[model samples]
Target: EPVSKLRIRTPSGEFLERRFLASNKLQIVFDFVASKGFPWDEYKLLSTFPRRDVTQLDPNKSLLEVKLFPQETLFLEAKE
Candidate 1:
């Protein structure tokens, strides 16, 4: 999938405004996210996947959130 948007949260609890491209490759994704002018070295990537189980979660959540198929989705964390 193509890169969507740039998401960043500062250590000071501030959200930076920027945009980024997404890629399956780590290096490419990092570069794309970094180019947006955010401190890419200190952030994380959280990804989500598709699921069919709806009753497995609590009233607010579902079992679909507990599992993922590796080939379907991925999450990356860029940390200091």
Candidate 2:
């Protein structure tokens, strides 16, 4: 499995940064943000640069296949 760096930001301006395997699913990032005091049931992820939303990616898809390799920055956004 290939390993890559993933950076997740929270609503509080906090971040979740760590190295993840390319085989790991996107759900892992969700689980991490959820574990960090945010609700898991209605959350999605957002990215920077153009500030696009990446929450639509399949949870079962691998990090590499999902194209979030090398390094990425994501944020959690909950549904109302």
Candidate 3:
């Protein structure tokens, strides 16, 4: 799996740059997120234009399958 770039924004106004194997599952991103600070249950990823939950996606599927390759903008939503 080749590397792909991604951009994640936190509610605190922090932008996180990431790279992962395109063939790797979305779970990898969560692993990264956990390692960085946030727990899997503490927050979630989302998008505007209506609303989509990126973190709630299928973690077993590859990033390419989810169409997150190349680049994607994900914003964080801290659990209340």
Candidate 4:
């Protein structure tokens, strides 16, 4: 199985790295962030270009399906 490497930029200007299976659901990514102390309800995961909200997408979708396969960097933003 292919692995998806993710680099997340936190609000505090810290970067975090994680690896997930290509078939892993987006929820797992959310869980990973929450594990780092940022809850899904308090922060949003965003894509760099087009400023898409990853947290707004279907949680059931796989990282590959969401185009986060192989490797990608996401930003953690505070909610309004």
Top of the candidates by TM-score = 4
Best by lDDT: 4
Q: List the residue pairs that clash in candidate 4.
A: none
- Residue 80's lDDT within candidate 3 is 55
lDDT at residue 69 of model 4 (Cα atoms)? 76
Clashing pairs in 1: 3-21, 3-22, 6-20, 45-76, 57-62, 57-63
Better of 2 and 3 by TM-score: 3
Q: Look at candidate 4 and tell me the lDDT of residue 32.
A: 93
Per-prediction tally of clashes:
6, 0, 0, 0
- Name the runs in model 4 displaced over 4 angstroms: none
Off by over 4 Å in 1: 1-24, 50-80
| Residue 49 miss distance in model 3 (angstroms) | 6.2
Write one digit per residue (lDDT tens) for candidate 2, span 21-80.
888887886676677776655766776754655666677887787777878887888764
**Ranking according to lDDT, highest score first:** 4, 3, 2, 1
Model 2 regions lying over 4 Å from their true place:
49-52
Cα error, candidate 1, residue 24 (Å):
6.7
Considering summed lDDT, which 10 consecutive residues are worst modelled in model 3? 45-54
All candidates' TM-scores? 0.30, 0.76, 0.84, 0.93
lDDT of 1 at 44: 54
In candidate 2, where is summed lDDT lowest over 10 consecutive residues? 48-57
Rate residue 77 of model 3 by lDDT.
83
